[PDB]
From Swiss-Prot, chain D:
Belongs to the PsaF family. The lineage of its organism: Eukaryota, Viridiplantae, Chlorophyta, core chlorophytes, Chlorophyceae. It comes from the Eukaryota. Probably participates in efficiency of electron transfer from plastocyanin to P700 (or cytochrome c553 in algae and cyanobacteria). This plastocyanin-docking protein contributes to the specific association of plastocyanin to PSI. Keywords: Chloroplast, Photosynthesis, Photosystem I, Plastid, Thylakoid, Transit peptide. This is Photosystem I reaction center subunit III, chloroplastic. Signal peptide: none annotated. GO terms for cellular component: chloroplast thylakoid lumen; photosystem I reaction center. It comes from Chlamydomonas reinhardtii (Chlamydomonas smithii). One of its GO terms (biological process) is photosynthesis. It is found in: Plastid, Chloroplast thylakoid lumen.
Length: 192, 203, 217, 165
């Protein structure tokens, strides 16, 4: 048990203690059944890893200064680029290569039943050969992943509000903090 | 038992355990004890915010007539600058009150379960829980020494009086179009030609 | 017990444990529609669905219609909001109606098969992770899980009170929507305007004077 | 419009027929007094004639070569060109009242078969029971589809059959 999402409240009797990120947060009781809970642990770890990659990518694009995460498909809604170097491909070819590669990798992952923490060639540096620090890094992994999921939904909502990138909106929040937030928006709070 | 109307038959569920128990419930709204717990806590909360409201409407107007950033009336506080738009202040208000309000609600749901400081886990409210009457750091000057049967009753009497006073300020302002201390100054200048019936018929 | 008419005889199908334990039972079936218990189960469900969508609809009428008389929320009249929104929108109304027919038909068929069999939508395997949280809550028409997030239906000493508040507010919102339609055809103004006219002159501006609702007088 | 028919407010034989009926009524009118009851009755007749032609031109009816209103009996074509009020709304109104009559008669028959004198309750009508079923017959489509879905609308094969079958 990593803590308590709301102190005073009790932990549900279906979430076991030896699980990465068990704050007891299940109001809707979605995982009272073990097969459902197994599938959701798998899905939570996969969503967390993809969201860490996506948030790190959007931060890297905007900090290195080639637009934001929203300007990146504008050549294809309309030439691609990467590290400023142009990449000689088109939308249909990219969708073909991505579909083949992700279908292959995803299909190899889906053949294994309940593999969440695979190791092996996925884990070349061998940090998870101790069975205790590996579990502490599982807890760090699920916390970073939940934080990056919240960060990416914040990116999407923040861009739907202001129409700007997250680093530029952070610059606005540092310049005029009481004049640039979700309430000068005019969208997040509909009044005034 | 001091009745709201002496000689009348009082509702049997009212027993003096609540502060200010005068047997007044003609609509029988407190029959269920669960609803009576909710209504007791809501009476306390509406009463305390109304006491702060009547203080915040009196004291700037009581200081505006005598010898201070603005002497603006209480219902024109929105049309003033306050270094920021009111929407951002609304957002800050809703975040900090989301925290405090849900913490009070978790105390009311499970009494004896919202007492210790979450960040600095040595700080703690004592075990005299009493939902609605926290204690500890909320009583910093060491009061409550008295039984509080008396202090709780004074608290609910001043609170009912200020709830009636704020329902006043809304009504008097919406009728007369003006400020309440100027309304009291007119009632002191000529009480016999300035009554509710006089102004209502002068409409 | 309480009844819609004191002194009238209560129908014998609304005076059983299964009928008296339902919600909002006042013995009102003069046309005898619920004599069949299967019909009364189906009509309980139809009343619950009409109650909830009527409350949501009448709230969408009133709260923008009340706040449009104050400062914010310049919202059109409820009999003009579809035209104004589809001018504001991006899709044609036919495509939007087709999308809502598919998205509503899925959910509706879920509810339909739950009405047919109560322990139905919790087949292990039939849903990805929905399947655990899509059973009933031992009373049909009152689901649990993702429906009702805040856990207000957990305390049993409040439960009949919440039921009866829901069925009263629902029947009253159905009366409100039939009123919205009727007033719209009779007067030609919005319901807040009708309320302002009945408050401005009650004894002369009502349905006895509109020249439509009773034309013999 | 539909089937080559012009609208009646656009048709010319419709106006000619209106003018012809007014001409016959005023030729009958021109041989009386003013405040006399035949003149009053004929002016009421002319008022009803003008009101009738104005109402049929207002309702959007389709006229032919003879200037007479034609009805459209096709649900889709009527609902497409605004003619549901002439066949489609009347057929659902009729089916409501005809099933009303039939369902009240059926409930009276089932109520009087459960006594010791069904023929006596068929010759001398039980008026309170008949008025009770006549008021309760307003929910006849719901009650009919429920009795359909329970398998109690229909008698089984305990019916009378001939030697052949
Ligand atoms: C991500 C899921 C998650 C959700 C939905 C909540 C929900 C809540 N927790 Mg939180 N927690 C969650 C994860 C965690 N909490 C905590 C540690 C705490 C503490 C220590 C406290 C909370 C409290 C709260 C409340 C915060 C009040 C507020 O900000 O209102 C803002 C205003 C609004 C209008 C938004 C709310 C609706 C809220 C009910 C507080 C509480 O109420 O406890 C009784 C509290 O004291 N949480 C930890 C670390 C252990 C978490 C792990 O991820
Ligand atoms: C809960 C107590 C409370 C009461 C009784 C009022 C009452 C009022 N405030 Mg309000 N406010 C209150 C809370 C708050 N106000 C504001 C921020 C404002 C602003 C900026 C303004 C008001 C104004 C008003 C008036 C609204 C009349 C109207 O026609 O609005 C309908 C129009 C709109 C809603 C737009 C009225 C005097 C207005 C005023 O003072 O004009 C005389 C005004 O301009 N309030 C904030 C910060 C978010 C509040 C915090 O809870
Ligand atoms: C992205 C999908 C996702 C999935 C599949 C899970 C799955 C899980 N979470 Mg995790 N969680 C997530 C994201 C997710 N989480 C995010 C983003 C946060 C930070 C807010 C958390 C914070 C969190 C805590 C603190 C805890 C969990 C826990 C759990 C486990 C038990 C809960 C359960 O059975 O419900 C299954 C969950 C789902 C089916 C989620 C799917 C999405 C639902 C259906 C709709 C959500 C929409 C969302 C509210 C929209 C927000 C919009 C915004 C503008 C308001 C389960 C393994 C508990 C645990 O034991 O950890 C392992 C626990 O204590 N979660
Ligand atoms: C992951 C945490 C996180 C952080 C650090 C930020 C930060 C920011 N947001 Mg974003 N946002 C987030 C999540 C986050 N957001 C989520 C989940 C949503 C969907 C509800 C949004 C939707 C959103 C909109 C619509 C807007 C912003 C804006 C902003 C900027 C101004 C401050 C503000 O008003 O915040 C918004 C405040 C909230 C969303 C409430 C806080 C709720 C979070 C998730 C609780 C967790 C915070 C944590 C306890 C403390 C911070 C931890 C952090 C240091 C890692 C600021 C850079 C504004 C902007 O563009 O500035 C110019 C703006 O208009 N955000
Ligand atoms: C909870 C009840 C309550 C509420 C909602 C308000 C709200 C307000 N007060 Mg009031 N006030 C209150 C109680 C309250 N007060 C009490 C109990 C007192 C006596 C201590 C005052 C004494 C007071 C004065 C002298 C003034 C206000 C002012 C204000 C306005 C600006 C607030 C501000 O700038 O913060 C201050 C900023 C920080 C604390 C930072 C705001 C409408 C100002 C105003 O213009 O009122 C119309 C103002 O000049 N208040
Ligand atoms: C004015 C009437 C009044 C009275 C008689 C009480 C009485 C009490 N309060 Mg309550 N309280 C009040 C108003 C009052 N309160 C208001 C308006 C609020 C909202 C801020 C509260 C919020 C509150 C909390 C959070 C707590 C109490 C508690 C208590 C109890 C012990 C503390 C004490 O003795 O202070 C006596 C009160 C006074 C001497 C009033 C002082 C008047 C000030 C100085 C005026 C301020 C200046 C003005 C704005 C101009 C006692 C029953 C505590 C408790 O029950 O612990 C077990 C507790 O934790 N009260
Ligand atoms: C569940 C029933 C229901 C239905 C069918 C509608 C339908 C509509 N609403 Mg309403 N609304 C509802 C409930 C509903 N609302 C409720 C419960 C509220 C109170 C929160 C509102 C408050 C509201 C506002 C403030 C507005 C609408 C508007 C609209 C229109 C466009 C919305 C849109 O494009 O969404 C995607 C559409 C006619 C908008 C409108 O009418 O603009 C022309 C609009 O501005 N609604
Ligand atoms: C009694 C037999 C009968 C007959 C001979 C017709 C004849 C007609 N119908 Mg009608 N219709 C009927 C009963 C009938 N209808 C009933 C009972 C309904 C309700 C279910 C409809 C609902 C309906 C609609 C919605 C439409 C028609 C249309 C038509 C016209 C062209 C279609 C056709 O040739 O299909 C031969 C008819 C049948 C085999 C009888 C069954 C009718 C089915 C249920 C509906 C057919 C609609 C058709 C697929 C739409 C074609 C579009 C067209 C532009 C090509 C034709 C005059 C269309 C029209 O308006 O044309 C201008 C049209 O849009 N009908
Ligand atoms: C837990 C629970 C339990 C209870 O019972 C109930 C409830 C409460 C319901 C629940 C909750 C839930 C939740 C919270 C959810 C959320 C989620 C999320 C947010 C996700 C995201 C998630 C997210 C994600 C993955 C993301 C990812 C992303 C990515 C890849 C990105 C990408 C990109 C980039 C790079 C950039 C470029 O230019 C573009 C793009 C393409 C854009
Ligand atoms: C019980 C009984 C019994 C015996 O036996 C017999 C008898 C007597 C016959 C019976 C009775 C009956 C009755 C009375 C009924 C009625 C009902 C109703 C009223 C419904 C409504 C109902 C109603 C409803 C649902 C409604 C809903 C609504 C809605 C959603 C709305 C929506 C909307 C909105 C928001 C806005 C926009 O802009 C538009 C719209 C779109 C419009």
């Amino acid at each position: 048990k990593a803590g308590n999402w709301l102190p005073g409240s009790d932990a549900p009797a279906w979430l076991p203690d030896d699980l990465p990120g068990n704050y007891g947060f299940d109001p809707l009781s979605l995982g009272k059944e073990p097969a459902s809970l197994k599938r959701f642990t798998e899905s939570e770890v996969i969503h967390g890893r993809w969201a860490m990659l996506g948030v790190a990518g959007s931060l890297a694009v905007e900090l290195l200064g080639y637009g934001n995460w929203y300007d990146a498909p504008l050549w294809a809604v309309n030439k691609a680029t990467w590290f400023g170097i142009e990449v000689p491909f088109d939308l249909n070819a990219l969708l073909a290569f991505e579909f083949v590669a992700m279908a292959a990798a995803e299909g190899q992952r889906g053949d294994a039943g309940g593999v969440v923490y695979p190791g092996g060639a996925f884990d070349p540096l061998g940090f998870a050969k101790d069975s205790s620090k590996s579990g502490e890094l599982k807890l760090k992994e699920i916390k970073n992943g939940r934080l990056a999921m919240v960060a990416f939904l914040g990116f999407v909502a923040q861009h739907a509000a202001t129409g700007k990138g997250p680093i530029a909106a952070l610059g606005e929040h540092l310049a005029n903090p009481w004049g640039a937030n979700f309430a000068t928006n005019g969208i997040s709070v509909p009044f005034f | 038992l001091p009745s709201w109307m002496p000689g009348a038959d009082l509702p049997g569920y009212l027993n003096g355990t609540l502060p200010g128990d005068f047997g007044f419930d003609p609509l029988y709204l407190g029959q269920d004890p669960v609803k009576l717990k909710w209504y007791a806590q809501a009476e306390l909360m509406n009463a305390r915010f109304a006491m702060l409201a009547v203080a915040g409407i009196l004291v700037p107007e009581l200081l505006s007539n005598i010898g201070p950033g603005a002497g603006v009336a209480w219902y024109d506080a929105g049309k003033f600058e306050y270094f920021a738009p009111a929407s951002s202040l609304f957002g800050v208000q809703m975040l900090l009150f989301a925290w405090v309000e849900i913490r009070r609600y978790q105390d009311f749901v499970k009494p004896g379960s919202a007492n210790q400081d979450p960040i600095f886990t040595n700080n703690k409210l004592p075990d005299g829980n009493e939902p609605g009457y926290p204690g500890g750091i909320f009583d910093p000057f060491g009061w409550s020494k008295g039984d509080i049967k008396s202090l709780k009753l004074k608290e609910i009497k001043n609170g009912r009086l200020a709830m009636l006073a704020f329902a006043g300020f809304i009504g008097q302002a919406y009728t007369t179009g003006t400020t309440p201390l100027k309304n009291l100054s007119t009632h002191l200048a000529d009480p016999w030609s300035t009554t509710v019936w006089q102004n209502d018929l002068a409409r | 017990r309480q009844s819609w008419l004191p002194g009238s005889q209560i129908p014998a199908h609304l005076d059983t444990p299964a009928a008296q334990a339902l919600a909002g039972n006042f013995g009102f079936d003069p046309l005898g529609l619920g004599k069949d218990p299967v019909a009364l189960r189906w009509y309980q469900q139809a009343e619950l669905i009409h109650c909830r969508t009527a409350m949501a609809g009448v709230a969408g009428i009133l709260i923008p219609g009340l706040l449009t008389k104050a400062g914010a929320l310049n919202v059109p009249e409820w009999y003009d909001a579809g035209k104004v929104a589809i001018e504001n929108s991006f899709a044609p109304w036919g495509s939007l109606l087709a999308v809502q027919l598919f998205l509503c038909g899925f959910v509706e068929a879920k509810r339909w098969q739950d009405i047919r069999k109560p322990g139905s939508q919790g087949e292990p395997g039939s849903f990805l992770g929905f399947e655990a949280s899509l059973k009933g809550t031992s009373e049909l028409g009152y689901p649990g899980g993702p429906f009702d997030p805040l856990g207000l239906s957990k305390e049993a000493d409040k439960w009949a009170d919440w039921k009866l508040k829901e069925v009263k507010n629902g029947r009253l919102a159905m009366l409100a929507f039939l009123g919205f339609v009727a007033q719209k055809y009779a007067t030609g103004a919005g319901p807040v305007d009708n309320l302002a006219a009945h408050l401005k002159d009650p004894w002369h501006v009502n349905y006895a004077t509109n020249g439509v609702s009773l034309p013999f007088l | 419009d539909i089937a080559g028919l012009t609208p009646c407010s656009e048709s010319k034989a419709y106006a000619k027929l209106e003018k012809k009926e007014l001409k016959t009524l005023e030729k009958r009118l021109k041989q009386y007094e003013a405040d006399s009851a035949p003149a009053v009755a004929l002016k009421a007749t002319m008022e009803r004639t003008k009101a009738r032609f104005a109402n049929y031109a207002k309702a959007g009816l389709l006229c032919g070569n003879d200037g007479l209103p034609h009805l459209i009996a096709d649900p889709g074509l009527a609902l497409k060109y605004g003619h549901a009020g002439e066949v489609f709304i009347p057929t659902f109104g009729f089916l409501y009242v005809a099933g009303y009559i039939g369902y009240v008669g059926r409930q009276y028959l089932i109520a009087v078969k459960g006594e010791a004198k069904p023929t006596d309750k068929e010759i001398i009508i039980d008026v309170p029971l008949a008025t009770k079923l006549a008021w309760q017959g307003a929910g006849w489509p719901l009650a009919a589809v429920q009795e359909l879905q329970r398998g109690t609308l229909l008698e089984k094969e305990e019916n009378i059959t001939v030697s052949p079958r």
